[PDB]
Design a binder for this molecule. Structure first.
Ligand SMILES: CC(=O)N[C@@H]1[C@@H](O)[C@H](O)[C@@H](CO)O[C@H]1O
Ligand SMILES: *[C@@H]1O[C@H](CO)[C@@H](O)[C@H](O)[C@H]1NC(C)=O
Lengths: 49, 49
């Protein structure tokens, strides 16, 4: 490749990253964080500890 | 798909055979890895000198 700053749009270098997800029957280990809230007491509430 | 290791340590005074007593074993570690384990060995700390 002959990438140069003088090159126009479509000719300049572009960094590309492709993410793919694999689901082998092994236990899943990678994904986003679980949100959390505050703790309340002495009130009938529903919870997901 | 989970490798569980449980462990326990005890003070002993008898020499030859296993002591006659009861003591539960606590969980030590869990590993989320999938292998079809069928055989194993043991390692020794030989004094290479
Ligand atoms: C968990 C536990 O009690 N381990 C004991 C340690 O306390 C003691 O100092 C040692 C004596 O050889 O035997 C083992
Ligand atoms: C264990 O054996 C099953 C049955 O053939 C196979 O699907 C799996 O890939 C094997 N796992 C390993 C780690 O060899």
């Amino acid at each position: 490749y002959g990438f140069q700053p003088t090159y126009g749009v479509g000719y300049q270098p572009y960094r590309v990253v492709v993410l793919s997800f694999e689901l082998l029957h092994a236990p899943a280990t990678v994904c986003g964080p679980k949100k959390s809230t505050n703790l309340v007491k002495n009130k009938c509430v529903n919870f997901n500890f | 798909g989970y490798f569980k290791i449980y462990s326990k340590h005890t003070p002993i005074n008898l020499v030859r055979d296993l002591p006659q007593g009861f003591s539960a074993l606590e969980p030590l570690v869990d590993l989320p890895i999938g292998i079809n384990i069928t055989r194993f060995q043991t390692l020794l700390a030989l004094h290479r000198s």
